[PDB]
Structures are given as C-alpha cells and as structure tokens.
Amino acid sequence: GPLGSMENFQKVEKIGEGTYGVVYKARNKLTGEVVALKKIRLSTAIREISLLKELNHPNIVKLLDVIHTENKLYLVCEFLHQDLKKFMDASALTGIPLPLIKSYLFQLLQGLAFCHSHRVLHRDLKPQNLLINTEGAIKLADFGLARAFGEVVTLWYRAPEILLGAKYYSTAVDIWSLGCIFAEMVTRRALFPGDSEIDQLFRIFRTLGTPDEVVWPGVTSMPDYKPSFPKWARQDFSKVVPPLDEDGRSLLSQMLHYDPNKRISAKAALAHPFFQDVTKPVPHLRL
Ligand SMILES: */C=C\C(=O)N1CCN(CC2CC2)c2cc(C(=O)OC)ccc21
C-alpha cells in the first residue's frame, strides 16, 4: 500500500466538512500553492470521482487531483476566498445587494446547466459548498456521488421527491436546492429549515401546499407518500419572498414546482426575464 504521498501538503486551517470528509486549507510544501484538501476516511468511486476532474467550468470549483493512498482518499481542490454561508452571515444586518444575488444565481445556473448537460448531478447544494471570490465569481463544490462511500446532515435544501422516497433523482433536485438558496439570500432566513425528514417535508407542505395528483401526477404512489399527510393550503409568494420583484418571484416559483417534470431547467432559467439586466458586481469580503 502507498505512503509518503501527502507530505507535500502542510495543513493550515480546518475549513469545513465535505460530503464525505473534512476539508482543510493546505499549502503545497514543494510549490507554495494554497489548496483546499478533502480527506475521505475509507473502486467504482475512484472512477466516478476522477471523471469530476474533467468537469471544468468557471462556476465549478476546480478538482486538481485525486490521491488514493493508505486507506484514505484525498481530493485536492482550488482554494476560494469565502463560502456563501459565511458571506450570508456576514451580510445579515444589511442583506446581500440584489444585483449581487442575481449575479450569483445566474452564475450557479450556468454551472448547473453545464453539469446537467453532462448528466452530472450535484445532489446536495448548500450555502456551505458554494464558494465565492473577490472578483464576483461563485462556484459549485462538493458534488454528491451517486455512490455514497467513505456533524449532522442539513435537510433544508432537499427536493421533495428525495424526501418522498424517489429512487432515481433527476437534475431537477439541484434546481430545487438552488431555489431554496435564492430565497434565503433574498429574505435572510432559510426557506424550509426542517430538523427531520418529516419536519422538512411538512415545512415545504405548509408553504407550497400539500401536493396531490392535481399539481404532481404520481405523487400519491411514491414510496414514502402517505394518504394521511395533513392537507395544507398553498401560501402566496408575496408572503414568502417579499423583497423580490415579480420577475424573481416567477422564476423562484418555477424552481420550486413540485413535479420534477414541471420544474424549470437550468438552461431555461438562464433565459428567464429576471436576468435581462443581470450584472457582475463585486462582493465586499472581509478575509
Ligand atoms: C477539493 C475540496 C472539496 O472537495 N471541496 C468541497 C468541500 N469544501 C467545503 C466543505 C463544504 C464545507 C471545499 C471548500 C473549498 C474552499 O475553497 O473553501 C474556502 C474548496 C473545495 C472544497
């Protein structure tokens, strides 16, 4: 078995918890490069991961290297300046400026359209794995594998078809997660902050109404659907995202359609009128 493969990286800071391991800010001992290092404590996933090394896009965090040594798996990523959760917390008193929200949403839709055009799903979009830099960019990170391998799981961004037991995800799950993040940037509160699967499901139901066959054909036959679910009425989007103009509200409503077949795709969303005046502002970052 392999050893000595990682003495070329000196760990500088602990910067989060990825989808399968802890992530450090590290410094390439040899080249001086500053990177983000995911350590997965341990294949068909050795190939599914290495395919992500080819998935290069301005709005996807660059996967530089996979280092499989000594019953541990390392992912070497480019390092970005801040993640969206921290920036949202830092902007709690003022709010992220709406043009910057719109830039960030637009860029993430571009990243997803690229990912989805390659039939790659993220599966677990969260403010914590959206990374931003000083230049105005935002990038997708920590893609969830179809094969899980290797804190507490956040459920707040989970699409309802996942919660309802759907065995096969579509790209629509990522559009749902990003809609939730969009709303959270605008209102400065999480849209659906459940603390269990059923609390998550029912928080969605209380806001968007309990889905039935009318709005979601097939919902009542899903593995975890129960006829005994409470029947809540749908609230109005004027109540859910007050600061958002009608263009933003209509886009968000389309990202949160219950039926994954009705949910807007990333590429369709790019053409939505909400982006006809999109710009690329600079965040104010305290690093
Ligand atoms: C290559 C490391 C990697 O896989 N990721 C995804 C995990 N994270 C953060 C994790 C969600 C808490 C992460 C962060 C960065 C970064 O630059 O943070 C400042 C880069 C890559 C990765």
Sequence ranges of the domains in the chain: 9-77, 82-275
CATH architecture of the domain covering 82-275: Orthogonal Bundle (1.10)
Q: Is the CB of 96 under 6 A from ligand 1?
A: no
CA–CA distance, 150 with 196 (Å, rounded to integer): 23
Q: Which long-range contacts does 140-144 make (Cβ < 8 Å, 24+ apart)?
A: 140/59, 140/60, 140/61, 140/108, 140/111, 140/112, 140/115, 141/60, 141/61, 141/77, 141/80, 142/18, 142/19, 143/19, 143/52, 143/115, 144/19
| Secondary-structure class of domain 9-77 per CATH | alpha beta
Q: Is the CB of 23 under 6 A from ligand 1?
A: yes
| Sheet strands (E) in the chain | 9-17, 22-28, 34-41, 63-69, 72-78, 82-83, 130-132, 138-140
Query: DSSP class of residue 46?
Result: H
Q: What is the resolution of this structure in A?
A: 1.7
Which is the closest atom of ligand 1 to the Cα of 129? 11
CA–CA distance, 107 with 110 (Å, rounded to integer): 5
In terms of C-beta density within 10 A (0-12 exposed, 13-18 middle, 19 or more buried), how is residue 277 classed? Answer: exposed
- Count of residues in the chain: 287
Q: With contact defined as beta carbons under 8 Å apart, do 25 and 65 qualify?
A: no
Q: With contact defined as beta carbons under 8 Å apart, do 103 and 278 qualify?
A: yes
CA–CA distance, 251 with 256 (Å, rounded to integer): 9
Closest by Cα among 99, 93, 87 to 286:
87
Rg (CA), the chain: 20
CA–CA distance, 5 with 22 (Å, rounded to integer): 18
The helix/strand/coil state of 60 is strand
φ/ψ of 75, rounded to 5, equals -110, 125
Tokens of 185: 């940037």
Burial 182-191 (b: 16+ CB within 10 A, else e): bbbbbeeebb
Cα separation values, 223 from 158, 208, 227, 243, 260, Å: 16, 21, 12, 37, 16
* Centroid of ligand 1 to alpha carbon of 232 (angstroms): 38
The helix/strand/coil state of 207 is helix
Provide the annotated active-site residues: 124
CA–CA distance, 51 with 213 (Å, rounded to integer): 38
Binding residue positions: 15-23, 38, 78-80, 83, 126-129, 142
Query: 């053409």: which residue's tokens?
Result: 271
Alpha-helix runs per DSSP H in 36-83: 44-52
User: Which of 11, 17, 23 to mutate for ligand 1's pocket (most ligand atoms within 8 Å of CB)?
Assistant: 23
Query: 């918890």: which residue's tokens?
Result: 17
CA–CA distance, 255 with 184 (Å, rounded to integer): 14
